[PDB]
């Protein structure tokens, strides 16, 4: 038997219960990009990884990278994730006349963070993804035969919600009061809003001056170092093979 969560999970309860334990994730925020603690690269806010920032804003578990999180062995605390957020966010380029200690002078110029802790709550999509991943993960062979999915989900639901409210009401006022009392913060938002839809000479001069430029004309940039990584992989494979011989 395992202790079951309360009806409404709050950051206070989770942070107090699991105090003294390592956080699940650490994220550093910069002016225009972010990264994790052990990540050497970076992610742009305009890249596909904006979903993680959206989930952080909404305090929801990111089910879309569940398999990646599993591969890394990230810890869960009653199905939630504790995340630490570090806030680092808070001449004449392309001129040949600039000086630099490694360059000749040139004759045309005269001469030379706040920290935060947050909690992300689970959702139904997360459980769906968990069961789906278990269905296609080899260990019978497979880790979970589909025909047992309903029983497994029933047992998980039984463990998650051990107590319900099974007391009948006698009139409409009692039902109204019960509905009012049981309201949930995550399901009490509001309905969304309807969806809605001098220098010209300088710009034209620049556009004219960039005529027939193959690459810069189209723009008028997210490096990933894929060729370098391919070279590294091939070099490692060749060296390892040479080890045998």
């Amino acid at each position: 038997t395992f202790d079951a969560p309360p009806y409404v999970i709050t950051p206070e309860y989770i942070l107090k219960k699991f105090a003294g334990h390592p956080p699940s994730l650490i994220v550093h925020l910069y002016q225009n990009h972010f990264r994790f603690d052990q990540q050497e690269g970076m992610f742009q806010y305009k890249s596909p990884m904006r979903i993680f920032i959206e989930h952080l804003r909404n305090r929801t578990v990111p089910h879309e990278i569940m398999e990646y999180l599993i591969q890394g062995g990230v810890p869960f605390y009653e199905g939630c994730l504790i995340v630490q957020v570090f806030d680092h966010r808070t001449t004449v380029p392309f001129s040949i006349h600039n000086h630099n200690p490694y360059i000749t002078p040139s004759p045309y110029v005269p001469y030379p963070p706040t920290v935060y802790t947050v909690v992300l709550m689970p959702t139904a999509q997360a459980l769906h993804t968990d069961l789906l991943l278990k269905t296609v993960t080899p260990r019978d062979h497979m880790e979970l035969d589909p025909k047992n999915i309903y029983e497994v989900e029933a047992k998980i639901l039984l463990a998650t919600y051990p107590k319900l409210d099974l007391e009948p009401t006698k009139n409409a006022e009692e039902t109204i009061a019960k509905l009012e009392k049981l309201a949930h913060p995550e399901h009490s938002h509001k309905p969304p809003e309807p969806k809605v839809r001098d220098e010209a000479l300088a710009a034209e001069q620049e556009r004219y001056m960039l005529t027939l430029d193959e690459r810069l004309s189209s723009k008028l940039w997210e490096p990933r170092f894929e060729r370098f990584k391919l070279i590294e992989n091939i070099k490692q494979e060749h060296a390892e093979k040479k080890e045998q011989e």
Binding site: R50, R89, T117
Partner: peptide, 21 residues
């Protein structure tokens, strides 16, 4: 824990909103 959510939630939300833009 440092920067506990219940008290600093508004500031974190504001900075996240600025980041998303």
């Amino acid at each position: 824990w440092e920067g506990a959510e219940p008290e600093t939630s508004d500031l974190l939300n504001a900075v996240l909103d600025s980041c998303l833009a």
